[PDB]
Amino acid sequence: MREIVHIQAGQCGNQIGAKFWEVISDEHGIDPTGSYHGDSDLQLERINVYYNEATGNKYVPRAILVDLEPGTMDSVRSGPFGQIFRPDNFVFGQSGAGNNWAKGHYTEGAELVDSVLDVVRKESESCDCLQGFQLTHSLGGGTGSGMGTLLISKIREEYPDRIMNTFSVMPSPKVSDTVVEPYNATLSVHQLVENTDETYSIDNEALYDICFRTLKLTTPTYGDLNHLVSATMSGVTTCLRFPGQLNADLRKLAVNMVPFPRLHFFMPGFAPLTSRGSQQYRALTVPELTQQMFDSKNMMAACDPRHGRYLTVATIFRGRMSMKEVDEQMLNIQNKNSSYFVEWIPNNVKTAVCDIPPRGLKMSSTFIGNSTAIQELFKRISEQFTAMFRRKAFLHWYTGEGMDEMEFTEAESNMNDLVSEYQQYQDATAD
Amino acid sequence: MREIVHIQAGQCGNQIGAKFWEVISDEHGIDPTGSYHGDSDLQLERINVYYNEATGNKYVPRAILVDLEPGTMDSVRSGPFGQIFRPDNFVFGQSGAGNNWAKGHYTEGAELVDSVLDVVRKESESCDCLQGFQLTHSLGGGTGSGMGTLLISKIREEYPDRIMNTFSVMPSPKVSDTVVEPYNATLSVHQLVENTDETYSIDNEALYDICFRTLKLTTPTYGDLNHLVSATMSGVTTCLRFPGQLNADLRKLAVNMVPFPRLHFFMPGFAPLTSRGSQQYRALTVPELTQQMFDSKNMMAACDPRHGRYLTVATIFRGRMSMKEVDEQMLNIQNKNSSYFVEWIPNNVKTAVCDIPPRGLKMSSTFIGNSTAIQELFKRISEQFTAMFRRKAFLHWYTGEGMDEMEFTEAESNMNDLVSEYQQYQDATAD
Amino acid sequence: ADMEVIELNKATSGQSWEVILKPPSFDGVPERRRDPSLEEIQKKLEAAEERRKYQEAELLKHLAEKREHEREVIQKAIEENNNFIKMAKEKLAQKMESNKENREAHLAAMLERLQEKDKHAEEVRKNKELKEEASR
Amino acid sequence: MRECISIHVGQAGVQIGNACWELYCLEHGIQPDGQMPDSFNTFFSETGAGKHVPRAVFVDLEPTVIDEVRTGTYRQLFHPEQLITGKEDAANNYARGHYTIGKEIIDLVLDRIRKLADQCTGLQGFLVFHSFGGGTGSGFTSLLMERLSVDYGKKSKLEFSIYPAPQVSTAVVEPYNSILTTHTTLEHSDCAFMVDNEAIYDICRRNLDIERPTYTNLNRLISQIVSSITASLRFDGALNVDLTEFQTNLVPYPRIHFPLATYAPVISAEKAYHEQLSVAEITNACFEPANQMVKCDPRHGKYMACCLLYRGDVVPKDVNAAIATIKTKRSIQFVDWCPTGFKVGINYQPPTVVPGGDLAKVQRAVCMLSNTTAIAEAWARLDHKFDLMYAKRAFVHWYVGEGMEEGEFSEAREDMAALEKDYEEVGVD
Amino acid sequence: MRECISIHVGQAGVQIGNACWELYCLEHGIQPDGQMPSDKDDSFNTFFSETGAGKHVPRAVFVDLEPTVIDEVRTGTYRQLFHPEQLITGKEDAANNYARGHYTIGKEIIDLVLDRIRKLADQCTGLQGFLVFHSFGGGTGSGFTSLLMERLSVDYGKKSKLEFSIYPAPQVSTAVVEPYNSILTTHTTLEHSDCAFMVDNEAIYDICRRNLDIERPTYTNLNRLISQIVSSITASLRFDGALNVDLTEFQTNLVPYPRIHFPLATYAPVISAEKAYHEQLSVAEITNACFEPANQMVKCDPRHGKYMACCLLYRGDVVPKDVNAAIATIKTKRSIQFVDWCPTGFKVGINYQPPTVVPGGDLAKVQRAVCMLSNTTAIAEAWARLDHKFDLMYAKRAFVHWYVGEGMEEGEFSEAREDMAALEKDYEEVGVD
């Protein structure tokens, strides 16, 4: 379990993916040319997980950049770390998906898919011990959503024994690029329930609320939202990127986090919450870091964790702090809040402490929860889907691509069954 | 839609036709030799509509001069613009029709018709884009009325897809050449109802009343009457002869003016009214123009427009004036006098402004109305026809030429149906 | 105050003995077979591998079914488009021909009326000829 | 390469085409000879000699209007073969444009479009410019649209339609031609942008202080809006919207494909200092009825979709802040079944104006395209004028004479009644 | 000779192996290169073979389904001590899944491991048997060990097999599924093991915190302490001792019933190296410490149980007179309840070899030390805690799909849990009269 192959699909997928690559490169001491300039060996110990060692020196991300549109691909190349990527790894079509899942999944997407598979196969064939795949995409668009889930299915068929992991961004009317987001999201969730092993549910609703209410923004931009995402992505991947005992690989993480195959939708959390211009604050102790675990305000999914129960939790602390203090502050939270942890999964909260803090922060905490409260996210998408579907609004753009109404009914039925399944475990006593 | 072929038949037809040619030649800057001496390039832009370019710098009217007697046509050759006409285009007999419609339609007329067709075919086949035909004639005589309608029918057969337009002069006991005028007019109206697309109803009764009552001419002559006709003919043909958007061709005019095939009898009107040579000291204002043009006294048909309702109206303003003022005055007339415009034909009055005024006038207005009040003209001819027909007076003049009484009965019946049809639309409500 | 010491062994790097505080209250000492087999082990390991292989093939069969459906919707969109074309082509040709038919019919009816006017004229001409010349 | 084919039908279509292509050239720095001292390639092809030729066909049944293109300033910009004319026009009769006269030039038009599609590596579809009123704009367009559905199937077809106004109208039969073309084109068009000549006439009088607006005045203003819609396709901006995106975001049902265009700001080339209006002020102006391209009252209707196309010195933050205030406006009602409704386009290039024109130079502008049920008022006004004349069969003989049947008039009017009923049904909760 | 083969399975097994072999070489004067100054013991030959170059090579095999941990041995201080062929690694680990270690991956490296053990057994003139070191928790420690144990019973029929098993603790735990892997391995290994010395990671963690003043104990801290207890247990096999002189003698002295083969180890003294002054602790004080639950290697209460066998293993400056006096005093104040069929007593062994500590380690060097190995029915409390965690998760079938996905049947979970219930019932029945 060494190499991970990273895939970026569509606008959102590529914007958040670019941001992830620039954040982790800084943490691993890699400059925008691919050369290592760091002052530590922990930075290079597990460099192989995300980077390939190039022809003499230099480190190149094992990333595949995908879009049905050339624009975003130009925007990345022109970005801060744009030149670090393998040029042959940029796979782009010429005609977009028109914000239509059916075009990304069946038409335009299906026409570009084999070119993407060819680039992923070259990266995969090069691996000594492939862990699996990490996909960044939105669920509201056409490419990231439709083509992204098509890629998941095609990758699953060729690599059935590898782990499929996604960073999936959920749409919100508060920050939307298109009228049909509830359709594209519902059709995608159906795919993710069946085809992924682990999904980080990144909700634009939660990201907006944090920027507006907590960061006191006013009118937040994708840049503001993506700053929370990059911090979350860096936090949740810490255990994969640095030496450690806990959830050190994709399969070991899934074994600790997923008690039932379909219940693999994680609610990520993060502390401290900061804005791009907010730099310099100094504060936050071990108890303060742990207190955010149950804090709804620190969740990257618009769910209140106190509305459900935790099946499993992975907690990662970054910076120079006492493991003694962390262990007891984590034990206290569990005892004080025992009603939000299922009793039938003993010792269900795992803690890890990494010495390297993220840039800007002296101390931080990242939470990965498999909570029954995630049903609130799915209920929200389901209600928005139903308001449109009841009237068959915009349906002709999907049926025009050869889709049947039945696919819509099946997708929503599957999403409602998932909601019922979280509810079942939320109510389970054991006892 | 470029070329118009003009035909003038009989005394009246040739006298009014000669007058039209001299008036428009002056407006287009053409001297009596055919050479262009004008300026304002607007004079030549649509010169092709009525004139042929005569190899050399000459312009020759596309006019065919027809009569069963040489008299009027020797008088035309000797007239002001007499030498401008093509000599081969003069088609004449020696017999005469003796103010008998049957002689013009069946006997003498039928014997000269093929010579006329010979000359019209040559002019028509020379056309790049033939609009159709314009005939000038009287309805009271024998040649213009009988032979003229025979020509309409023969031309209709060979050119069924072309527009057939006439300037038809209605008889009046006030001017009168015979007792038989009601017969010749009724037999001709029957032909016009079936075979023309558009007819300008030029009433000698109205022309006489204008000369006597308005112009204060105790004993009006044909010269006095023909001066009102030439002004009317120049006015109603302005849109065909100069560049413009509205009723710029024979078909577009018919489409805007004729809502029902048989109701194609126009009531022309004019302002201001003048006698010959007399000019001027005071030019009318736009508001004056737009009132006068809709007044009984200014109608070339002896009908009161306030006795009926307008189906459609084409209004043409000539001279240097404000289009704003014209538009504002034209809208006011319609709102103030809404009861004289049918409600069920929206935006039924169209306005055009030509910068070139007619000679003698600084400003003028021409009115082309399809009014249900025209039934007064037909009722007048019908009452005079019936007073004679009831007694079978002068009937052997027609039966002697091979005609049957039935033709009289049929013609009368058709004219009364036309009266009933105008009455039907006059009474029609929007609801 | 009692205790029994029974010497056991004495070696170079050690000494051993037994201490008995109390004899067993109860007497008569404490009052295996598998073996297993290589064939049995192999049979169970192989049975487990076949369960693992059956399920991997089942997932693959399901993924293959989604692939067939993907070809079907692409095919559906092709068929709907071809049909659209077909219908539009026939709807238009029926319209263009019906209009040709009505237009030629209208032009024939009108040309027939003008032709009848010609028949009536030579007929009128025949009547005058019988009135003229005769008596004259 | 994401190419769009523009088709200009009849006088209105051709004349607006002149205004659009004159403006596109100004926006891309293309001289009237096609020479240039990237995105525009979606609208202009290139020759080995370095000349940039519009991906467009100009059609008219009469040669007058197109002869001015062949003789004018932009003669040489177009190859002679893309400027198609017949001899006789359709004489304000839909039946002549569609059958009688149109049938003589249709194959020639299709052949030229085929030759243009042949130079496309990724054809998006067609932009069809025409009036509802004229015999060519109505009859020939309907014929063209049906034939394009045969030759290209479901390839996108979008319209820029000139809705008639009595103040500039040339024919009494314009409501008949409007209804006949709407009925026949309905199933062949994907999205149509109606431009009410009275709304334009009134903006020109009010905002531009023009006493008697002419076609040049009207067309220059229209061209500005059309350039806003095509700006996203002809440039690579901060946020782009292609032909497919326009369709997806603006049309909820196949028949309900008539978005309302609203443009802001429209200021006279004489005066301030207008006070470089902010993104908020220009956005707010979009929901005010005076700036609309079609006369109707959106306060009496419900929005189903809003596409906002910004151009010039505009930042995403300002746009979202401005949209957030629209979201708080109780007076701007969206339907039940639309969880959002917004779609944003942003381009770098400020609106360029024609040297000598009536419009003032602004730092930022916006065109909003909104699918409101209020647009049905425009169909109702047209249907009423149709009914008044049709009840008496006034002018019907002109169409029947060309081989049309009264049954078609009934079929066309019934389709319009269903369209009216459709706007009613879609707005309920 | 009387040779013993040590097998180190998974991370825990390999890491404890490092600590044990570092200490053994420290007790026998073997340098990390395998060199040892010849001087007139020679029992050390039971654990170390000799090469033609005069090097002393451990009679051990290190196995892991992943290379990281063993790569540190291949690269570290003791890299010249082991031959490359006795350090076996696969590529992918068992991902904390017993099924993966036993059925999927394990199956690929088993023959290679057996072949290497067979090559070590061929160098033996009197093979006593095997010492198997592994965790209950990991997929390799659990799954691969039970696979290995079954095969060894086939290839070596009779031969003794003893275990050093790492019982899971939440404070150092890496997987939620550790109770499942614990029960599955216990069920499968039960009939193949002769004697197992369980090492509860919480007990070690707690001794390190108390006795050694280590705020947050690491694996090195835990392993060094574990290595002291292993050293006490193996000393009479590696030196000319008198008690537990052969592997068979562990079953004889400590295991009267085949399934009841889990003795409790209690070690004393455990003293911080940075203490001060001190001491020195007497035979009485160290013997008293053997009857203190705080010094146990497994958390349980012997007061709630009955002894069926007790061994006291002394090391260093210890005299029989002091030992007997110390036992006599304890019998007065404490019950020390034995079962009816066993005598109340002790088999005592003194190994004169001094307790040895790792140079810069946490443990102080002591003159006297003792390890008590007792077979008490109280050890069943450790199985009960494990069984309870198993039941809570199993009742909902939580994480079961991970095992089933690897080709394991759900019925195996029921079979394993039923065997544990019988084991619990066996400890109950054994202590009745």
Ligand SMILES: Nc1nc2c(ncn2[C@@H]2O[C@H](COP(=O)(O)OP(=O)(O)OP(=O)(O)O)[C@@H](O)[C@H]2O)c(=O)[nH]1
């Ligand atoms: N905005 C605008 N409208 C125009 C223009 N030209 C004509 N129209 C409008 O379009 C309608 C007239 O139809 P046209 O496009 O001129 O006629 P056409 O398509 O050429 O068809 P035919 O001439 O009958 O063969 C009326 O509503 C006019 O006001 C123009 O340049 N700009």
Ligand SMILES: Nc1nc2c(ncn2[C@@H]2O[C@H](COP(=O)(O)OP(=O)(O)OP(=O)(O)O)[C@@H](O)[C@H]2O)c(=O)[nH]1
């Ligand atoms: N005392 C001690 N316990 C350890 C050590 N390493 C791991 N463990 C414990 O063993 C369990 C984890 O099992 P491991 O041995 O690490 O895993 P493994 O046998 O390699 O199996 P996989 O990694 O799943 O293939 C947890 O209870 C750990 O606390 C160690 O060095 N010392």
Ligand SMILES: Nc1nc2c(ncn2[C@@H]2O[C@H](COP(=O)(O)OP(=O)(O)O)[C@@H](O)[C@H]2O)c(=O)[nH]1
């Ligand atoms: N957090 C975040 N969301 C984004 C970003 N860009 C687009 N989105 C969201 O993504 C969805 C649109 O998907 P998008 O990626 O633009 O379409 P695609 O390119 O066809 O995949 C909507 O829910 C947008 O709010 C981004 O940079 N960050």
Ligand SMILES: Nc1nc2c(ncn2[C@@H]2O[C@H](COP(=O)(O)OP(=O)(O)O)[C@@H](O)[C@H]2O)c(=O)[nH]1
């Ligand atoms: N306005 C006008 N009417 C005329 C003129 N000449 C004759 N008429 C009228 O024409 C009718 C006689 O027709 P006429 O043309 O002379 O007979 P034709 O030569 O057989 O066709 C009577 O109503 C006359 O009043 C004329 O020059 N001007």
Ligand SMILES: [Mg+2]
């Ligand atoms: Mg035209």
Ligand SMILES: [Mg+2]
């Ligand atoms: Mg391991």
